[PDB]
Amino acid sequence: HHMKLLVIGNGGREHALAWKLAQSPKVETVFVAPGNAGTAIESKLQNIALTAYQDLIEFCRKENIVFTVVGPEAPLAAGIVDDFRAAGLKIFGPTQYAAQLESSKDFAKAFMVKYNIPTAQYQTFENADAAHDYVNQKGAPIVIKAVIVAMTLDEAHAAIDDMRVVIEDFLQGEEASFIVMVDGNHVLPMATSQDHKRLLDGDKGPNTGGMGAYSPAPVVTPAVYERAMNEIILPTVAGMKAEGHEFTGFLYAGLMIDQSGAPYTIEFNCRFGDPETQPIMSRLNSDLADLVEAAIDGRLDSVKAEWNPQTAVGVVLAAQNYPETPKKGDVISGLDDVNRIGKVFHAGTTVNEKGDVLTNGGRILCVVGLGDDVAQAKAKAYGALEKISFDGMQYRKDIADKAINR
Ligand code: NA
Numbered sequence: 001h002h003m004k005l006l007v008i009g010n011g012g013r014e015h016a017l018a019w020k021l022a023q024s025p026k027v028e029t030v031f032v033a034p035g036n037a038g039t040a041i042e043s044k045l046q047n048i049a050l051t052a053y054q055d056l057i058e059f060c061r062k063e064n065i066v067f068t069v070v071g072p073e074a075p076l077a078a079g080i081v082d083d084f085r086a087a088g089l090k091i092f093g094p095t096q097y098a099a100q101l102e103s104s105k106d107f108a109k110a111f112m113v114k115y116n117i118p119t120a121q122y123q124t125f126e127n128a129d130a131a132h133d134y135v136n137q138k139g140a141p142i143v144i145k146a147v148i149v150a151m152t153l154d155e156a157h158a159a160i161d162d163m164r165v166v167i168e169d170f171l172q173g174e175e176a177s178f179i180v181m182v183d184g185n186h187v188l189p190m191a192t193s194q195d196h197k198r199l200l201d202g203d204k205g206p207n208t209g210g211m212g213a214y215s216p217a218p219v220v221t222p223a224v225y226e227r228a229m230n231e232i233i234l235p236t237v238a239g240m241k242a243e244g245h246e247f248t249g250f251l252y253a254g255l256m257i258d259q260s261g262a263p264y265t266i267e268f269n270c271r272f273g274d275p276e277t278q279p280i281m282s283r284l285n286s287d288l289a290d291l292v293e294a295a296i297d298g299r300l301d302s303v304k305a306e307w308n309p310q311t312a313v314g315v316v317l318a319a320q321n322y323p324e325t326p327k328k329g330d331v332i333s334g335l336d337d338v339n340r341i342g343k344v345f346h347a348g349t350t351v352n353e354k355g356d357v358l359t360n361g362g363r364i365l366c367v368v369g370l371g372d373d374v375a376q377a378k379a380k381a382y383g384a385l386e387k388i389s390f391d392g393m394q395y396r397k398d399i400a401d402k403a404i405n406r
Helices: 012-022 037-041 053-063 073-077 080-086 096-103 105-114 128-138 153-162 222-242 277-281 288-296 374-385
Strands: 003-009 027-034 045-047 068-070 122-125 142-145 148-150 165-169 174-183 187-189 198-200 204-207 212-215 248-257 263-268 311-318 343-346 349-351 357-359 363-371
Touching: 003 012, 003 053, 012 027, 012 037, 012 045, 012 277, 012 288, 012 343, 012 363, 027 053, 037 045, 037 343, 037 349, 053 080, 068 080, 073 080, 073 096, 080 096, 096 105, 096 222, 096 248, 096 263, 105 222, 105 263, 122 128, 128 153, 128 165, 142 153, 148 153, 153 165, 174 222, 174 263, 174 288, 187 222, 212 277, 212 374, 222 248, 222 263, 277 311, 277 363, 311 374, 363 374
Parallel strands: 003 027, 003 068, 027 045
Antiparallel strands: 122 165, 142 148, 142 165, 174 187, 174 248, 198 204, 212 311, 248 263, 311 363, 343 363, 349 357
């Protein structure tokens, strides 16, 4: 009762995590370091401007913080979890070593090859000699990156000559994000979701961190769920344990599901947790604070997650020129009248002295609507987004259409 918690980061995923933690009747305050304009506005959320880990450790001691949750990759790769734990504090997130699973594609591919985790065949190349030899051995389609998706050997050999080259198998099918909580040994899967990482309607334009996601993702049938757990998630958790560096925290698995229902791992990476986390948290009925505490305690097998059966659709509003260097500093209008239509999660927003909310990053907002089916959830999300405006804003109008047409 009256617990105080700490969330590290400033993105839309962190807004959603802090907001959901604050729903617990047992939580009084969730501090967010540094937070954004959305977390400043939320009830029970308090932004704190601390960044140094020893400062955050003393803050936890000063305020009697029960536990800390870490969102983004950078503090994880810097060892925030190691530091907190050496200071005796409770924290949900991977150690610096275990975070390599999400922060180094070399470490992850090598790990996955070792533990026989399905993923794209992958090899890096010195000079064109063995590179052309490899492409001739593997055949097309195949991906050449230094990013050409080569449909023929001619395209692959051409891409090699033009361009250290990275040659990766092309994964066919449909993308899904498979997010799980891990306590080092046990797993508690979050609801499935599907992101839209291309910038523009019709999956055109450049790649992005994700322009909108919905949950559940029907491409992940019970059969696909079982395969993903059996072939990817459970062996990865067991493998990190067997390597002597258990993974703790949210594991963000990007999957490509082929036409046979076979899941292949794209990578484990933050880009499969935002904006995926937002609609997922909008569906979680359970007390997230209790789930996180059980995970920190190594007892995730003692708790369960229960979900609103309604679908949640989240639509990202982004700034002009994203995913390139974004236009910054534009006043955002209309945040006050969304009311019961939906929920607005902030990512790149800040407030100025006069109190206006300003764009302050690439992705600005994620607007989440709930519905009894995916069609209704999509209508709710766009209905809630309708009166938000800022100059140069961009968003896709086709979020979740792959689940509606079908
Ligand atoms: Na994403």
